[PDB]
Amino acid sequence: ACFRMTPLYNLPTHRACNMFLESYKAAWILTEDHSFEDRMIDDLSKAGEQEEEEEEVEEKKPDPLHQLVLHFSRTALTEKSKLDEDYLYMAYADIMA
Amino acid sequence: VLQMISACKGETGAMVSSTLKLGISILNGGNAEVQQKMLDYLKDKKEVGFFQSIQALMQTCSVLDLNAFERQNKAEGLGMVNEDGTVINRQNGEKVMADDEFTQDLFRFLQLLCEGHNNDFQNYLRTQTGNTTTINIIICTVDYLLRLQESISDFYWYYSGKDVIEEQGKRNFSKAMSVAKQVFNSLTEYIQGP
Amino acid sequence: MDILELSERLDLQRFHSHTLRLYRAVCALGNNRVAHALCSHVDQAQLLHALEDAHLPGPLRAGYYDLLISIHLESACRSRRSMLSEYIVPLTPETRAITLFPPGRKGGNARRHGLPGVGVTTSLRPPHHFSPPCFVAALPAEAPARLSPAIPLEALRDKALRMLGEAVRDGGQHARDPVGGSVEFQFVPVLKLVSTLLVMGIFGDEDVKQILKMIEPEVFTEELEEGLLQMKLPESVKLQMCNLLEYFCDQELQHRVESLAAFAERYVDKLQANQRSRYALLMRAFTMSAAETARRTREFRSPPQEQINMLLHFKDEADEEDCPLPEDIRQDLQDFHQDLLAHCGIQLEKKPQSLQELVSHMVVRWAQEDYVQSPELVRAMFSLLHRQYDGLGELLRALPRAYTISPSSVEDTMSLLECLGQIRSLLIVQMGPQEENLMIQSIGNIMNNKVFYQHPNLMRALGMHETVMEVMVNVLGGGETKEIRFPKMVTSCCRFLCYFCRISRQNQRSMFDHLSYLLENSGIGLGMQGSTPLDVAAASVIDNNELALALQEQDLEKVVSYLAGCGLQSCPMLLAKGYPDIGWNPCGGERYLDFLRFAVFVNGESVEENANVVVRLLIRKPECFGPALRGEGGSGLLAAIEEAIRISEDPARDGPNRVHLGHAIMSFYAALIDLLGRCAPEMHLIQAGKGEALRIRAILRSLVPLDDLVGIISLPLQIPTLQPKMSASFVPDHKASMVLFLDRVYGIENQDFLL
Amino acid sequence: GVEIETISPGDGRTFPKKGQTCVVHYTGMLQNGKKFDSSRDRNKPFKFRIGKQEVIKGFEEGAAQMSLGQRAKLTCTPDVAYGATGHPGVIPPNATLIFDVELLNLE
Amino acid sequence: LVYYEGGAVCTHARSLWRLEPLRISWSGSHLRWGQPLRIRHVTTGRYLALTEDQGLVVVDACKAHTKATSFCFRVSKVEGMGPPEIKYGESLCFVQHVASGLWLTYAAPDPKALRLGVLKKKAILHQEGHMDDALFLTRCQQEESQAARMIHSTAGLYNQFIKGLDSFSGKPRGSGPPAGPALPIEAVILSLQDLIGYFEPPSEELQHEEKQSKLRSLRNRQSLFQEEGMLSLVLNCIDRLNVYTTAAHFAEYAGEEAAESWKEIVNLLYELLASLIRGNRANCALFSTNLDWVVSKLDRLEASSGILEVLYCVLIESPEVLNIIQENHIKSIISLLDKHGRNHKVLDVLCSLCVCNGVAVRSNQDLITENLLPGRE
């Protein structure tokens, strides 16, 4: 087969575009944004309890991260047979690591 | 993380893989304080719920199979489809192990639990007081480092009559031996700190 | 009595409150038949009159908004929402001009993101269809139970926005008696209507530029009325705000992929033109140096996709460059890729002045000033800021659903896209005899559209093979064989799956992965014709030559266990016709074994690894063999078939399948030896230079004596004369299964060929 | 049998013929007094073609006997309009239908 | 008869056994090798014995005169607490009859049909036995053990009530002498009032963790009361009681002193059955065959709260029973609204006939539109 493999210059324009996008997964998959990792837990969680709070008695209002984890604990305790996918859990599990 | 693993009984899907990856990051080094919190909860909830998962999960781990190796050795003979972007899978490594990126972390998680010569996990893993039943992870891990040993020795006979090991005969081989080293590290950390 | 006084009864209101809940419940997940019958019952006018009304008991008329949204909409919203994930785009002149706000001047290149959602999208979406109610029309006896109810969309759009204009002004003014009773009744039912009308895109250009003005200070003023995101709100309307903000994220995403398509057009055009210039420079003209011909190899060799990799690698790479292009077309990427990695999230080292800053700075405030209950809420906003903090992550997870096509074919695809929607609505509804009819024409019209033959990559991106798969599993889900309700549709659909599997190699792989799933619910419902899920299971690997190597044993092991069943059962469904059913059923066995034939060889007597384990596994269960032979009583090598011959011309014995029973017995044993003639060790390439394959050859040769086998090729029934025979008895056409059984097992040698 | 009782007078010379459209701003009722249809709550007049069997038999034999601008009251017997099974959800089976038809324009 | 079973009955009350030593004092002391003892089945309330020829038969508590039972433990083939020897899960004790000196093992005579059919084996006291007994013990002493004696007590108190009730099935009273043996009424009323409290659903103000924990401890016990009957039993009582129609006046020929205590007994069963069905899913599937029976009545002047609630809880969990209504059950419940007034509870039930969890059915989502909707009364 290797001699009849048509040249590139005879392909229809519509088809010669889909191959470009699928092949051009060589500028995102290798580039790194970093960014959301260290600035995430910095602005979120820490410094969450700002001067907005006016008074307290015995306890303290949970900071924004504290709501997040307990939610995963909340859904974990739900009486079910098998855990679902919940890709949202994957998105935050990795960035916490 | 203990609550998340307990919910997933014995299915090694993407759930626990992304969860066990987290647990390594909290308790790297020694981290004595985080170990104390985990022990207190297990003594408080006093349900089994979790050691069933660990015992069942590691029994589903794979070893160095040989029959699957032959399936690669002829599938790799082909180089490209008639005309479709050549072999898209290329490496398609999922066969011999397809788990080393995961099964190497399960044992590391256990080893890091008994770090710093902590003499409560090193005793708790042997027998769970109270509760209803015990699991004894200690004897439950040595059995794995016997089936794997029977696999490498096996692999040796397949190459006993040859003279040079081809490139794909070493890439898979080094994968298995790296796993065996990680298991050996754990066994020491149940004994260190007598 | 007047409706307005039901606010002071508290018992008659409670009954009527549930009444309008029944009407919401009667209009099930698409029931255009009975939906219109409610129109004569409830109204067409006082619903439109309930909007402006202010005196409101609460759980009453405020609940009518949930009935207006149920008898006129979600007949397309429930479908158009599924349409929002794939981003098919055609080659159009309008598409040729799309960028990051190109009326920007200097600063506008790195700023002026543009208001989210203006127009020009060129995406392919089916249009809404509506019909007016008329109960004086002639008695019908086409459209599925009917098309849809109608309504003046023009009046609703203007009225809704004007109504919400009062809400923002009234909320700031404050009062001790809000519309409906307590603030949230004045907000949640009215802006929920706004959200549903927004996804259909009834609003256009000017209209959406005003809904953004409800959060004026930041988003508006591209060139008093405090924004909706300024005041404290209860824990219910905040959820709806998330449902509104969520619609705007993908609008930017839909704008994002179109920009790539715009760049995916002009840059590929010059690339093809410049590559031809590269040809004639090194074409027949050529020069010298010999080895230069070795260097120019991508240009004629390698598949076209391989060429793209070589020519695109160095463009967006760093430092090292190999086989480069002219340093004139390699500059726009370093600008476009720079331009792209300045819009989404990249810093590339007050007033938000951007949606990204607005959402991120706002969601944090909501958590810092409240402990949010209702877990359904907290899951909402946490899915937002993750998207606004990982821009490329969403993009990277969106391209595998994007596809470009050419004009003069959009009309053909438009019919396919609209027709495919009805299948998606079929999954949610339970199977009905009227609905069963609908799909058969639906799938029948799918396989004529001229587009499900040219672009298979679409159909795996839309993935209708996924959706149609659940259609089969629901109907077949049952305790035993008695649950064969709704036949004639599994056959009508399984035929479509087989042809899908015979269009491309990647199509074969994509459905192959469900082989274990398919066989789990395949060997139960046996007895019909045309097709069965077992057939498409067999067709999943017929000529791959590498899929056969990618089996997992357990699949082959479990199908064998099925064959153990048909060696001791009696076929009670076959028995139900009042048939002998002596010891076992050959009908079932002939189907399982036909599958195994396609997993022992792929192309001309090859692949033995799976073949080797088949014989070593099949021997373990001796009951797999028909009890006529390979047993303890007797074997009857030339007698078992002869016994079948005796029953062949015995109409009394038979069953007093659809033809006779002796043919079924002949079909079994002939097919079994056909399996163990191609499950032979190998050709003499291995049998003459090794000692492993000889072990298998000894085994199979020891189970079929040659003395009986040679004699079996004899006694043909008759020939038509004077009046042909019938295909109900033991024929002779299917006796060639014993020819290949001796051609590659014992083989010719001495001079026995004469005998 | 269609009983046409007049309500308001009309022109008296222009009557509908075959193949011709009519606009009719009707409102239908039952014998008990319960309204089941109206074409004035929608503010969209009903338009139909005479002779092509769009409307029921009682409606067109009712609209053919009137003049332009005339408003009459029909009493359609259940034999000529939805006899046995009826229209499910709107009209009960074996029910008498009353129509207050008014022809606005074009015969 | 005694059998063996895998990981199916291991979470069931059938496989629970109680050990009763022969002494009266220090019976709770540590158990040691070489000590005679008896074996009792908890829910059956019977011992195990081999009398003369019938085999290892589960004998009652009246023919167990310390010679037929006579069991003890052997390693291989005291006025105090005593020495603790036998452990949990690894003691590997061997069972042996004392008088006969035999060893217990499985006969396991399996034909072709038995091998592929019932996975059940029979145990016999063979003279030499097999080599694979290794009977080790597991401890289950928790809330479920308390809810084991309850089955025997309630099931032994119910059937005696029906059996006594069944005697006067068709005999009009010879006014004066009411009947023969009397009937218990105060006992059952207290008994039923306990289980409804015992099966009372989890509260609302409790937090998630405590609510979820008890939610697991309620579903199990609801299923545990089905495998030992007690669904047929409560069904059986309704069949016998519901024969007496009208009021206590027709029930007069059963003892007029118990007539005035008729309404509450009829009532109390119904919400008891609702407790056994509400929430749980497996039990709801049982009513598919009995759907016609429950929907039948819907008319007794003292059943209104009971029947509308039991029907409400079986159409909220199982969509299977939802598919077994043809044309007449719908108009029956429709007529209920026509005879018992304007009740929002019934209208809510009709919403259940509509879309189920996710999936919607159209075979019946038109009948209500054509039956309760066209008429405007």
Numbering used by the authors:
A (entry chain A): 3634 to 3730
B (entry chain A): 3779 to 3972
C (entry chain A): 1648 to 1788, 1793 to 1874, 1922 to 2047, 2089 to 2395, 2414 to 2479, 2487 to 2519
D (entry chain E): 1 to 107
E (entry chain A): 244 to 320, 331 to 630
Could you give the paper's own sentences about this structure?
Therefore, we designed a series of insect-like chimeric RyRs that contain the diamide-binding pocket from Sf RyR and the remaining parts from rabbit RyR1 (rRyR1).
This allowed us to visualize the binding site at a local resolution of ~3.2 Å. Compared with the unbound structure of chiRyR-I4657M/G4819E, the binding of CHL did not significantly change the conformation of Met4657 but induced an ~90-degree rotation of the side chain of Glu4819 toward the cytosol to avoid the steric hindrance. Both mutations form direct van der Waals contacts with CHL: Met4657 contacts the benzene ring and the chlorine atom from the anthraniloyl moiety, whereas Glu4819 contacts the distal amide group. The superposition of the structures of chiRyR-FLU and chiRyR-I4657M/G4819E-CHL revealed that the G4819E mutation would form a major clash with the sulfide amine moiety of FLU. The structures of chiRyR-I4657M/G4819E, regardless of the presence of CHL, all adopt a closed pore. Notably, to the best of our knowledge, this structure represents the first instance of a diamide insecticide bound to a closed RyR, albeit for a resistant mutant. Based on our complex structure, which shows that CHL binds to the resistance mutant pocket in a different conformation but also disrupts the S1-S3-S4 interaction, future designs should focus on achieving shape and charge complementarity with the resistance mutant pockets to enhance affinity over CHL.
